[PDB]
Amino acid sequence: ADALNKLNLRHTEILPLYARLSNSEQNRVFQSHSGRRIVLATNVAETSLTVPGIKYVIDPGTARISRYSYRTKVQRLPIEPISQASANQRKGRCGRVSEGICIRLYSEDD
RNA sequence: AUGUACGUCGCACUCAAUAGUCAGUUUUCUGUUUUUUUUUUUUUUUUUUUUUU
Question: Helicase C-terminal domain spans which residues?
Fold first, then answer.
């Protein structure tokens, strides 16, 4: 969000979204705007939120996955590439209003 | 009582100077004084995720 604000995009605003977000700030994403808004989201909009007004989705193919191993004896959360169904779930969250373009920031064979 | 005896001598200092043996290629570094202090104690820094009589 700092990097998108530094470019100073014309007629565009940047919005965050996560589980720790304020309820007023969570609902502010749901309220309308003028022009184009860019929403930076986490796995909250993956599962339960179903944020509306989304045309194009950008997928890094990278998320954090909570784990717990016998060696660790500790809930470790390493950064890992996502699954196929989760990536295919990232395809469907922009085809809500009309036809959208999904961009995945990795290789097809990956 | 008488007569009775006398003469010459030596010594010192010395003593110099002698055989043969020719030659060794060209070039080179190495070199000087000056500011001097070599060392000054450190810090807390980020967030998949989601459900319970």
Answer: 1-110
